[PDB]
From a paper:
Glutamate is the main excitatory neurotransmitter in the human brain, and it exerts diverse responses through ionotropic glutamate receptors (iGluRs) and metabotropic glutamate receptors (mGluRs). mGluRs are members of the C family of GPCRs, and are divided into three groups based on G protein coupling, sequence homology, and ligand selectivity. mGlu1 and mGlu5 belong to group I and predominantly couple to Gq/11. Constitutive homo- or hetero-dimerization is the defining feature of class C GPCRs, and mGluRs form homodimers mediated by the intermolecular disulfide bond within the N-terminal extracellular domain (ECD). The large ECD of mGluRs can be divided into two parts: the venus flytrap (VFT) domain and the cysteine-rich domain (CRD). Here, we present two full-length mGlu1 structures in the apo and intermediate active states at 3.96 Å and 3.65 Å, respectively, using cryo-EM single particle analysis.
To enhance the expression and stability of mGlu1, the wild-type mGlu1 was modified by N- and C-terminal truncations and the optimized construct was expressed in the insect cell system. Therefore, the connected CRD and 7TM are also relatively far from each other. In the apo state of mGlu1, the distance between the Cα atoms of Val523-Val523 and Asn235-Asn235 from the two lobe 2s of VFTs are 60 Å and 30 Å, respectively.
Residue numbers in the entry:
A (entry chain A), B (entry chain B): 35 to 132, 152 to 839
Write the structure that this text describes.
């Protein structure tokens, strides 16, 4: 029959405490348990034999309520744990109906994959189990799993601690590995999710099984050992044997000093992971739990003796297994042990206090303050249990646990949040050889509930500031866009934007509107070309000087004409003729100085009054003279025509020649009232702002084409003028004047259309055509009359 | 200390037949049970014993293997079955370590909630549950629920049968109702999904609670009044108490017979729920399980005695329950009756066999066949349990049960598919009037495995009855636009297709192409017939008559001209210049003949010769006859010019006139090499395609640009030549003919723009312009000369 340890009291509490090992792999149909464990077995059974003797006599935690124990071996195998679970349940359910008291809770199964399989049983009877080691994620969901809370932190905390280490050195693109099953998968899924909220891009997602072939660790090496300049921090949510395989693979192909792996809880400080491969792992971070060794136990356990401990069955087999000595004094002595011994042995022989024995005594105390919250809220002012508490429940008792907090045995508090997750107080251990060849795990600070406080004076002392997650650098210089490289996020590509493009997004610039292109580093679109036209260009200063020289030659002609009326030719020919051509030429010569200007609304009126009225009134003045002689030439002696449409005075003929002047003034007024004189900003390029007045091709072909047909009217009535015995050869120079104006008049338009700054072409073309007309007409008729 | 009925054997089978009632006695913690149900308790305990006493005695099913049994009570409670199950899973454990023997399976607990909470206790020991009543939807998840067969239909099968009724009468919009809690939610979500993929639309799902106010049941009917003419039928997925409330509120308002209700499995043979509300219930279909009456049990059970059945506790104490008697002769007698029992009593006292007595004896035989697989396939050619198979296994039992099948007690086959679901074989009922005041259920066909088998001549007794509850009528008529009525596809609102719209899809009428009206039956777009006429219409008979009379009158003016050479003007002047009038206008009068024609590349080209070159030749006539005297004007004494542009002969003046004929031809011939005449389908409307050959405003004014200069040149040299005494004032005749023809030839083009039938305008106008030239030159020529 399987034996049990039992401590008396009133409110007895059950426990599992994996005494024996796992039964043999094939003997599970009869499920006969293996050998004693003596780190988890007989160190923990004595936890519930001396801590339950502290609480016994403690007058502040259970005053005058005697607490009790039961310990039923689980043999690390879910079948034996389940057979033993029905015994607590049986005696509880027979007791509540009718030597057998109800068990109030369970001090936790050893692993996590027996915590699910014993909670699915205990959930049905309303009895909370309180785990001390069950670090698996899916035991957190309070929809399936109510009766399960822990004094050991969950796997979302390890995932977050690994994110905090990685993101505290600006690492943001990492390879990932994890062992197959629930552990590595769950932890990597948690971490990979938390990574995806801060722009981390896991360079290589991976899976591998622990006893998979040497080819599987070897191909894993090839895979991860590609992209070496891009990512060197491999996050390993791994077990010790998977990492021992990856270090053994890295020994074989000899790529020892390449990349800096960071571990998980699987390989805290234990040396089975590293032994024989000490050179591959130097400068390798882990995280481990902080379970402080309890000094209050080493006193008790190491003063124990075989002969004076009758409350622990499994203890005589523990002595025989520890000391190689069959003791035939008491029964159940193994045959393989010779050299019969005494009870005067040192329990000190390679004694090591358990890692997870701070957790058993945090766990029992969490279960012994649910019986203080209950004993005062439901039994106010009583010594011993009152009636309503006496046949103890679990539904109210679980709430009196989930709101319990305390101080532990190591100064740190035990307290449960809303889903039974204990506080994450995690250490960090870098591994490095400090003295001669001795590779050890050195403590370098702690994670502490999101407060990472890693000590950089002890962290590495390896190579300099280790090449980051550097696949595509932070290349965001002046003018730069981040190309993103569709497929991947982190490896974006470093590329400049065009000149016109402004940095709207750091990921994409936009070519801002015409009128604008941005400043240095493409930040803000400023009113770029304020380029001036008003006064002159320095090249247009010769055209300004030629307009001035024009005004000089009109004043030279006035110096011989107006105040010197002493000439027979101007006495016999009408004077008003010569007054209207000098007024025409004067208007066409003040014009070029008013042309070069920054066009405004009123300055556009000036500029169209310039081209329209100056050219038309200049040539209307010239044709008043040529019309007066044309009327003679066509109506006197050479063109035989019947009609005489003329008046009986020379002044009336000068007035008839003046009728045509005003018609071009009516044309330009009807063209101005239609489309107004307004300045327009011109953008033929990104750096060009000529700001030209409204002066369409309609306004430069209509009045100028009407002066062109007026030169054709002169040419028809200036045919035989070449050889006529008229006034002092003047008539042949009238024909030459019309030829020299009409040739450049026709040559103007093609060069005008093709050229850009064609306004200087208009001023120089109008100025040259009028000065050759002035010169040809006047310079013989002023020089021969001396 | 609840009791157990047991019988001896070699392979024992457990069951949880609900002996007592669900005790609300105080609460759970006392655990005291109610009364022996006798329609669910003791009635099926002797059914298990009868079923086993047919199997211990036939050599076909378990020869030399003896079955045993363990009948225990569940007291119809979630927390009494859970205590009792522990004595089957503390026989398997103790009988395999260490009389007591292994129990192989648990035959069904009745209530479905017990069948979830006692199968999260039988996974852990690998023991098949075989349910006989557990109609839950989610007891088919083979991830959470694995050791769980059931010989009763799933609720997705019933939800399919519900849909199949509504799909056979061709209904497509219906209001839903379901009782809150697992039953109604499950089966309504199943039906809503099945509806959604099929193309139904559930009108309003006012799902309600069972024990709400009569004003909440009023609020159901207050909503039902919306869409009362449109989507009137309810699918009541409820227990009978919600139906009782829904007919209480129907009687309240007096909205008696507007819609029928198609009831679910909760209301099919519930008559108790319709006692007093029969007037609201007529015409309502239902659906029930098909569980046949078993005769073999009824004969055995009704012949039983209180002194013979020693294998059944509860049965020496059920006699007082059924018969209202009390005997001092039996121990543990109830006090509340005081008429003394006898041993010899009738047991047929309103005996009705259970609805599930054909489901117990089907379930046990599913086991006895699944062990006739195990005893064959592990112990071949053996008698009794062999070396292996003892203690009997878990996961090999379950893999021989899942492929067990053999005919039941009632001719129907038990057989499991891969999820422990039995076959869907459903009856139907309906409340109807059979005789004088007789609302009762009548069977009206069956639903078997998705085949529905109603016969209408026993259902509803009404031809039209419930109208097609569709959210719009079947709006598909001849060529109707569908807006789809986006709230639901199938219930689209009909709208009228536009004059240009067509159905590419029925569900979207959309516009056709321009000039291509939407063809008959809206199957696309269709082009229409063209307005052109090659052969003569009545409107062309006038035009060809004008063309041909035009030719004949030219033959008459030649009869008075070329045959009669006694003309004063001609035979002094050239005869060919008076003849080239007729030669030129020949083609001008032929314009109407081949203008009003078909567009073909040669005939529509000939029509471009009509618009261009023929019109050029008909004005080549006019320019020869008027520009001869015009050029002679410029060269004679009557008007003088600067040169001598004429030779010494009239034959030189003929080829000089032919220069003006040549440039008039050449102007329009420069365009014929650029545009070859292509027939353009220029559509002036959607109801006309019209087909004008290659024509534009440029195409018709192509000769007009030189006609204007020819007429103006000949007008300037004929302006006052009218007043000059010609041969008989014929210069004034010519001046009047040009004056009348010119102004109407300008006034052509506003009529060409206003009126669209340009072909009639050009032919009619050219006929009007050429007739006056003959009527006012050639007729006075003839009349003066004769």
């Amino acid at each position: 029959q399987r034996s049990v340890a039992r401590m008396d009291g009133d409110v007895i509490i059950g426990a599992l405490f994996s005494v024996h090992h796992q039964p043999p792999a094939e003997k599970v149909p009869e499920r006969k348990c293996g050998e004693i464990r003596e780190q988890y077995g007989i160190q923990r059974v004595e936890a519930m034999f001396h801590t339950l003797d502290k609480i016994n006599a403690d007058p502040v935690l259970l005053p005058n309520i005697t607490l009790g124990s039961e310990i039923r071996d689980s043999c690390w195998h879910s079948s034996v744990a389940l057979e033993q679970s029905i015994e607590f349940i049986r005696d509880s359910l027979i007791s509540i109906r009718d030597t057998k008291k109800p068990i109030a809770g369970v001090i936790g199964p050893g692993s996590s994959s027996v915590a699910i399989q014993v909670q699915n049983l205990l959930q049905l009877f309303d009895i909370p189990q309180i785990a001390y080691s069950a670090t698996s994620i899916d035991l957190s969901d309070k929809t399936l799993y109510k009766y399960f809370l822990r004094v050991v932190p969950s796997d979302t905390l390890q995932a977050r601690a690994m994110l905090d280490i990685v993101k505290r050195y600006n690492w943001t693109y990492v390879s990932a590995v994890h062992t197959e099953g629930n552990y590595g998968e769950s932890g990597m899924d948690a971490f990979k999710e938390l990574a995806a909220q801060e722009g981390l891009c896991i360079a290589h997602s991976d899976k591998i099984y622990s006893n998979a072939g040497e080819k599987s660790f070897d191909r894993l090496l090839r895979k991860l050992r590609e992209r070496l300049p891009k990512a060197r921090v491999v996050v390993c949510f791994c077990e010790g044997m998977t990492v021992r395989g990856l270090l053994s693979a890295m020994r074989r192909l000899g790529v020892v000093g390449e990349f800096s792996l960071i571990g998980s809880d699987g390989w805290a400080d234990r040396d089975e992971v590293i032994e024989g491969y000490e050179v591959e792992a130097n400068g390798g971070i882990t995280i481990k739990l902080q379970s402080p060794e309890v000094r209050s136990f080493d006193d008790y356990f190491l003063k124990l003796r075989l002969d004076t401990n009758t409350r622990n069955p499994w203890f005589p087999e523990f002595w025989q297994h520890r000391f190689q000595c069959r003791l035939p004094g008491h029964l159940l002595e193994n045959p393989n042990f010779k050299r019969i011994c005494t009870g005067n042995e040192s329990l000190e022989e390679n004694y090591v206090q358990d890692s997870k024995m701070g957790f058993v005594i945090n766990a029992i105390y969490a279960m012994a303050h649910g019986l203080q919250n209950m004993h005062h809220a439901l039994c106010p002012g009583h010594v011993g249990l009152c009636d309503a508490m006496k046949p103890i429940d679990g539904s109210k008792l679980l709430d009196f646990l989930i709101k319990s907090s305390f101080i532990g045995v190591s100064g740190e508090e035990v307290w449960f949040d809303e889903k039974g997750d204990a506080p994450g107080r995690y250490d960090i251990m870098n591994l490095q050889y400090t003295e001669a060849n001795r590779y050890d795990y050195v403590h370098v600070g702690t994670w502490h509930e999101g407060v990472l406080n890693i000590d950089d004076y002890k962290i590495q002392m390896n190579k300099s500031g280790v090449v980051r997650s550097v696949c595509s650098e932070p290349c965001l210089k002046g003018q730069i866009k981040v190309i993103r490289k569709g497929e991947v996020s982190c490896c974006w590509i470093c590329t400049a934007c065009k000149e016109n493009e402004y940095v709207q997004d750091e990921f994409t610039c936009k070519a801002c509107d015409l009128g604008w292109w941005p400043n240095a580093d493409l930040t803000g679109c400023e009113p770029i070309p304020v380029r001036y036209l008003e006064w002159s260009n320095i090249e247009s200063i010769i055209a300004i000087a030629f307009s001035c020289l024009g005004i000089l030659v009109t004043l030279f002609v006035t110096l011989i004409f107006v105040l010197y009326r002493d000439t027979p030719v101007v006495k016999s020919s009408s004077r008003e003729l010569c007054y209207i051509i000098l007024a025409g030429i004067f208007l066409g010569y003040v014009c070029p100085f008013t042309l070069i200007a920054k066009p405004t609304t009123t300055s556009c009126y000036l500029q169209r009054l310039l081209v329209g009225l100056s050219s038309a009134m200049c040539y209307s003045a010239l044709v008043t003279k040529t019309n007066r002689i044309a009327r003679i030439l066509a109506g006197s002696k050479k063109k035989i025509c019947t009609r005489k449409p003329r008046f009986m005075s020379a002044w009336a003929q000068v007035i008839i020649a003046s009728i045509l002047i005003s018609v071009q003034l009516t044309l330009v007024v009807t063209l101005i009232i239609m489309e107004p004189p307004m300045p327009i900003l011109s953008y033929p390029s990104i750096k060009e702002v000529y700001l030209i007045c409204n002066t369409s091709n309609l306004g430069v072909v209509a009045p100028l084409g009407y002066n062109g047909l007026l030169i054709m009217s002169c040419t028809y009535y200036a045919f035989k003028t070449r050889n006529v015995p008229a006034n002092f050869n003047e008539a042949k120079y009238i024909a030459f004047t019309m030829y020299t104006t009409c040739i450049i008049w026709l040559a103007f338009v093609p060069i005008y259309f093709g050229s850009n700054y064609k306004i200087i072409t208009t001023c120089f073309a109008v100025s040259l055509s009028v000065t050759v007309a002035l010169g040809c007409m006047f310079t013989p008729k002023m020089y021969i009359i001396i």
